[PDB]
Amino acid sequence: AECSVDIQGNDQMQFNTNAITVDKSCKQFTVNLSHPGNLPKNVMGHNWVLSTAADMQGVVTDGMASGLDKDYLKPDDSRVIAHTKLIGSGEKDSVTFDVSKLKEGEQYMFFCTFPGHSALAKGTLTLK
Amino acid sequence: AECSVDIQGNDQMQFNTNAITVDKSCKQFTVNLSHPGNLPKNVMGHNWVLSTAADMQGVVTDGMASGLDKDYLKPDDSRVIAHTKLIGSGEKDSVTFDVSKLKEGEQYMFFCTFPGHSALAKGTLTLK
Amino acid sequence: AECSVDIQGNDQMQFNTNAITVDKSCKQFTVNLSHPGNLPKNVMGHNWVLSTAADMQGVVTDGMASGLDKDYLKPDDSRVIAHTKLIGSGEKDSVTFDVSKLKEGEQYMFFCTFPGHSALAKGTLTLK
Amino acid sequence: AECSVDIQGNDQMQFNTNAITVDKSCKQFTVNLSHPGNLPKNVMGHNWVLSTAADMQGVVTDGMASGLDKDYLKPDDSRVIAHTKLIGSGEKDSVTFDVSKLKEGEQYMFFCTFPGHSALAKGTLTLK
Ligand SMILES: [Cu+2]
Ligand SMILES: [Cu+2]
Ligand SMILES: [Cu+2]
Ligand SMILES: [Cu+2]
Numbered sequence A, B, C, D: 001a002e003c004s005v006d007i008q009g010n011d012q013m014q015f016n017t018n019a020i021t022v023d024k025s026c027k028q029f030t031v032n033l034s035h036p037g038n039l040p041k042n043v044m045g046h047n048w049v050l051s052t053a054a055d056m057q058g059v060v061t062d063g064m065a066s067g068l069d070k071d072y073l074k075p076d077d078s079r080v081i082a083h084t085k086l087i088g089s090g091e092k093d094s095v096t097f098d099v100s101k102l103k104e105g106e107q108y109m110f111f112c113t114f115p116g117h118s119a120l121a122k123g124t125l126t127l128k
Helices: A054-066 B054-066 C056-065 D056-066
Strands: A006-008 A020-022 A028-034 A047-050 A092-098 A108-111 A122-125 B004-008 B017-023 B028-034 B050-054 B092-099 B108-111 B122-127 C005-008 C019-023 C029-035 C048-051 C092-097 C107-112 C122-127 D004-006 D017-021 D028-034 D049-052 D094-096 D108-112 D122-127
Touching: A047 A054, A108 C122, B054 B092, B054 D056, B122 D122, C019 C048, C019 D122, C056 C107, D049 D056, D056 D108
Parallel strands: A006 A028, A020 A122, B004 B028, B017 B122, C005 C029, C019 C122, D004 D028, D017 D122
Antiparallel strands: A028 A092, A047 A108, A108 A122, B028 B092, B050 B108, B108 B122, C029 C092, C048 C107, C107 C122, D028 D094, D049 D108, D108 D122
8 A cells, every 4th residue: 555565475476466556646666575375485475576578488498598696687687677676485675766767658577587487477567 | 344344256266255254252253255357267266165175175175076067066075164156257155154163273165166177276265 | 490490389378498599500481380289279379480589579469450361460561570370279380481591699589479378478589 | 198297396486387198108207307597406496296186285284384394395205206406597307107007087196296386386297
């Protein structure tokens, strides 16, 4: 509530929400991710990455090839509007970003870049 | 909250939740399912089916064998605790079941049986 | 292997391959598609659509709007480099294309345009 | 074809097949597994475990609890009919079993027990 959202990635690779509504009146928007489970980073690590539905696929392919020290994200990926760290069981991670990096008339996708998870852990973000 | 749940399945095959908690004092429990999108039942229909985590894959395999006229649920499946019918977008359906068919301790999966969707349209139900 | 590849889309909405590699010494490349399941193409149809990684989302969204009768592909779409027809279990379709249309350094993604199938029925294709 | 199939787990967490049919004329059936991508065993290793459609939840649960060191498989698990070792890209493994351990009319699921992979890396097996 306000200009933030608390989201969870479980051991079953599913976020607890498929949709995030960003109110255009927010100057900044924060996402507080938690990985409630028992599995660790290297096996079920989850990050929350934000891209345009159109770049997502390249973000994902590239992120896969970047490894864990990279959090499965390509360093200095212009396509990545925002992201948290790859966390694991019990760790938390927040991210704050400028809402002005977002424009209406665009479809944004949030997902996780850990190899193979994007197929299940993803959703939509809209500026309304 | 209390003794009902309203859930939505959308056009990307995801349920709006992946955890349902049934209070042990509800005599009955009602699951209200709706389908937001723009897609027809034969292409993107959902149903909500409840079964033990054990029976889920057999109910899911026997379901697509049953075809669209059977809501992709074998009829009289003994492993199905409760189910709605397959709804296309624009539709809705409620199912009201007896809380005495569930034992605490035991694990339950809710899911969709439409061909290949249970891979993403699934979650857990807990008597609490 | 050679200058052609056999691909299968099944009843679970998955392709047997998620990575293809075209040898530069191939003038053309042939994709032979089949559908090893039991379901109809109005329920579980599959096509093989080739676009760049960047254009995938557009072709898919534009494609799901043109419905069945148009094989879920927007006609005369300029992002589609090559495609098959939508087939059902039991059907077949191959498409030969010009390798000269691919360029080294670009990221191509193959997918199926049927509603929701690209969630798993997708893969990368690269020149080599 | 004949009394064996070649299966393959990739970097997307999928098998090239989700349906196996063991003919009643096979005295032994063989599964040759492979891992066509390039991620390692600790990130994306996969195995091939056969059990009844009924026993799959548990094998999988006791298995992800056992650890990589144990091929994520409960040592001396009874519900497991056959299985290979966990392989990473580049590696191969095979398992041959007697068709006598299987019966007609019963439903089996082949799968991978590496944490979370059975969500997609799963299939059916029937003696025909
Ligand atoms: Cu994840
Ligand atoms: Cu569904
Ligand atoms: Cu398809
Ligand atoms: Cu695996």
